[PDB]
């Protein structure tokens, strides 16, 4: 199981913390407009992560790995608000409307980092399909205490309703990782190269996205 | 209007019909076709949470997405889940965990199990709906009458050992009347899709409860 230092390696020499997008962030040195079209583009992928669990659970015959996946699931989409409702009040709280979020055409490089997922969690492991989900997951309880951290500080956000996404879980979101570490290992079957090769893709496509942000 | 079509293909191809549960319902099985044909299910029971996230999982009507989840959820989240219940059921009739689990399904088992994944995973969600639908809104009428005959022929006093067939069929009604509004929600011009789903999926409940005589 060193595989398993060698995905959290990878990980952290390509982390979107790093990114010039979010160093920007952690300094103020982002306009409106950036936040803004930052948010819009992101929901495209907030809408998918509901079908990233469960295309890797549709082809699940471990019902305890079953299980843990439905939990993440549960998690994003079920009651109200869901992760999808909070991510709409975050976008709202930076002056786009509903209907200029409905009518936002994805970017090129959003679809392209969707269509990464997808094909991983509908590939033929479900090692690396939880792999490439864990190699985005892992980073966000210190991403969402960063963007936290630069909303209050420099973007105006007094109201902490605003950024509910990033807080009413913040927690969930540790145990979601630690969940996907331990299903990795549940479904390995001798795929490990494939886990690390998602987790390559992932994290160069996250920068990709990123990248659209800045000139 | 083709839910109607599709509702009279499944009156006239229908479980509580099919010799097994003629027999059924008169006390006319065996405790050894009983104990045959609750391991042989055992297959389809823990396939259906798969059956409800590959539709999901094809889907961007996010409220569409909603009620596949709640379907989901009753079948899989909590303890005891459905899967669960089905092997108290089994136990119940006389069968050993260890037997159940190394029963071997059999391929009238496998085939009707390949029939709802291919539909469920196929192009057509309306279609995918269509063939759970077709097997779903059967349940509270077949729920009704097992139970009927597990206590009255079978031995069943204790109603903890049928609970599969209680604690849920009265979801199942709510599971049907959603499963009808999904196929709406999501009809892509593909009406004659739902009806061939509803046309194998019928078949093939026919050839599973074949194997048992």
């Given at each position: 199981?060193?595989?398993?230092?060698?995905?959290?390696?990878?990980?952290?020499?390509?982390?979107?913390?790093?990114?010039?997008?979010?160093?920007?962030?952690?300094?103020?040195?982002?306009?409106?407009?950036?936040?803004?079209?930052?948010?819009?583009?992101?929901?495209?992928?907030?809408?998918?992560?509901?079908?990233?669990?469960?295309?890797?659970?549709?082809?699940?015959?471990?019902?305890?790995?079953?299980?843990?996946?439905?939990?993440?699931?549960?998690?994003?989409?079920?009651?109200?608000?869901?992760?999808?409702?909070?991510?709409?009040?975050?976008?709202?709280?930076?002056?786009?409307?509903?209907?200029?979020?409905?009518?936002?055409?994805?970017?090129?490089?959003?679809?392209?980092?969707?269509?990464?997922?997808?094909?991983?969690?509908?590939?033929?492991?479900?090692a690396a399909?939880?792999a490439?989900?864990?190699?985005?997951?892992?980073?966000?309880?210190?991403?969402?205490?960063?963007?936290?951290?630069?909303?209050?500080?420099?973007?105006?956000?007094?109201?902490?309703?605003?950024?509910?996404?990033?807080?009413?879980?913040?927690?969930?979101?540790?145990?979601?990782?630690?969940?996907?570490?331990?299903?990795?290992?549940?479904?390995?079957?001798?795929?490990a190269?494939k886990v690390l090769?998602?987790?390559?893709?992932?994290?160069?496509?996250?920068?990709?996205?990123?990248?659209?942000?800045?000139?």
């Amino acid at each position: 199981m060193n595989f398993l230092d060698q995905l959290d390696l990878i990980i952290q020499n390509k982390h979107m913390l790093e990114h010039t997008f979010y160093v920007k962030w952690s300094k103020g040195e982002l306009t409106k407009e950036q936040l803004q079209a930052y948010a819009k583009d992101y929901y495209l992928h907030i809408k998918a992560f509901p079908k990233y669990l469960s295309a890797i659970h549709s082809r699940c015959d471990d019902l305890e790995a079953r299980k843990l996946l439905l939990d993440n699931l549960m998690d994003e989409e079920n009651g109200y608000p869901n992760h999808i409702d909070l991510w709409k009040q975050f976008v709202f709280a930076l002056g786009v409307t509903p209907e200029e979020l409905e009518a936002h055409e994805p970017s090129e490089a959003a679809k392209a980092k969707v269509a990464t997922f997808m094909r991983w969690c509908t590939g033929d492991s479900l090692a690396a399909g939880v792999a490439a989900l864990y190699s985005y997951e892992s980073q966000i309880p210190r991403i969402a205490r960063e963007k936290i951290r630069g909303l209050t500080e420099y973007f105006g956000f007094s109201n902490p309703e605003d950024y509910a996404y990033f807080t009413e879980h913040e927690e969930a979101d540790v145990r979601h990782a630690r969940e996907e570490k331990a299903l990795i290992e549940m479904l390995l079957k001798d795929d490990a190269d494939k886990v690390l090769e998602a987790s390559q893709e992932v994290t160069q496509s996250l920068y990709g996205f990123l990248d659209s942000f800045l000139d």
